[PDB]
Symmetry: C2
Subunit: 279 residues, 2 copies
């Protein structure tokens, strides 16, 4: 009923069937983490039984955590890669997008899966449900997830998409941190800084390959640490900055100011280049 | 701040303000669509100013189907429907439409707008707003700020303004439903449809008169009917549409679609009403 390949109910494929359809292709799973000690262990544990089987590689991309994120991740048997270790030749910039970009240099899988580490009790079939359309179907190179309340999603991302890219209006969770894509697509696209990375990869994939290369899959219900409104303001600002860039609209580059005292949050207009150029 | 900003409770008294009017009249307009639960409290906070500082107080009924009108009448307020405000012109849906038509239903040199979904508003709202207009000079538009917490404001309006109109970054509540302005300014500006009217009047006033003509005043704390996220999504879409329009950016005109799992599409409008002057 939608111009977008959409799996509404729990996918039929089994872990056995999916591993067969791989056909020589490898699968890397990346968990981006910045101070996520309370939830990181549950996330890793839900994925690690797939290692050496369906999943060939599982790493945690530590974005400079100061809490017990690393030591707990190690204690769960996961390989922990810092931003520095992922790409030592290049100095580190702040932001989520930076970590996700660098993670491409720390993995070698033909298919890369991204899962947020702030998930509260994630289902162990998340990764299989994501690589589904990539392994079975053809033409698909990007699989987004949807669930369930996403204030930035429902008030900023989706209304802005409706205004400037109405073709992507059928995407339920454009800012979803849970998605999978081929290395071919990811290393060919630029990576938006900060929280712009999700909405940036979506629009850029659409512009390059059209809706036919994009699929979305239901993962049920999601629970995560709900953030204070001020953090969401900065997050929203970066989403707007990235989205405007992809639509040929000049952004002021001026960070969002909040007041009763004044503080200004950083915003970045600088994308990282496609990972291919770092060959 | 480069914007005339009153941070603490204004010093003026009802007596002083009423004096500084100098022949000028003041109209207060309450736009209302199904607000029976809160309309009475709002009117009551203003009605003691009637025949004094406030010369005119009307409720602009935007087609309410509940007991909004009868409760408003029982509170001594004049109730004007969209049809009655301007009978020559057929009625369009939306808040902006009502606010536009209200200019034809009032005769004050200064027009004050107050949302009727306020939960127990302070009775000094109207005096605190007409302050900079009556005493100071150069000011023709006074916005309010206060204290959820303005989810559409903090996630959509203010970040979008920072991106496309950073000069207006000093406005704390650009989507504030509580503001006052001169009839000259209001009748000279176009009116954005739906919930776009607030952000539209701000940017249009800025473009025409600059920051010097705009002031903002602290009103303390505000409480109003908290709406479901789906309504705010549609609200955000209209705010975006209006804001993009004022920045020379083509809007798709496609309404926001939501999947709650069935599909429903909310209306969006790119059609402004012309300045009220053209209806002279």
């Amino acid at each position: 009923a939608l111009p977008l390949d959409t799996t509404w109910h729990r996918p039929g494929w089994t872990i056995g069937e999916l591993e067969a359809a791989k056909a020589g292709r490898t699968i890397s799973v990346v968990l981006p983490a910045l101070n996520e000690e309370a939830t990181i262990e549950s996330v890793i544990d839900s994925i690690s039984p797939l290692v050496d089987g369906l999943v060939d590689e599982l790493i945690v991309l530590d974005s400079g955590s100061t809490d017990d994120t690393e030591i707990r991740a190690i204690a769960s048997g996961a390989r922990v890669v810092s931003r520095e270790q992922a790409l030592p030749e290049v100095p580190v910039r702040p932001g989520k997008g930076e970590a996700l970009w660098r993670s491409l240099a720390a993995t070698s899988g033909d298919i890369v899966v991204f899962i947020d580490s702030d998930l509260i009790n994630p289902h162990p079939l998340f990764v299989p449900w994501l690589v589904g359309p990539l392994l079975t179907g053809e033409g698909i190179q990007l699989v987004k997830s949807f669930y369930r309340g996403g204030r930035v999603t429902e008030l900023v991302a989706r209304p802005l998409l409706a205004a400037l890219r109405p073709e992507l209006g059928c995407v339920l969770q454009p800012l979803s941190g849970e998605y999978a894509a081929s290395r071919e697509l990811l290393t060919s696209l630029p990576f938006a800084p900060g929280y712009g990375v999700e909405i940036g990869l979506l629009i850029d994939t659409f512009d390059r390959l059209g809706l036919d290369a994009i699929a979305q899959v239901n993962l049920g219900v999601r629970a995560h640490r709900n953030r204070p409104l001020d953090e969401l303001g900065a997050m929203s600002r970066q989403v707007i900055a990235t989205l405007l860039s992809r639509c040929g609209i000049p952004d002021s580059g001026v960070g969002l100011t909040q007041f009763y005292t004044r503080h200004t949050w950083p915003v970045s207009l600088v994308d990282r280049p496609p990972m291919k150029v770092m060959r």
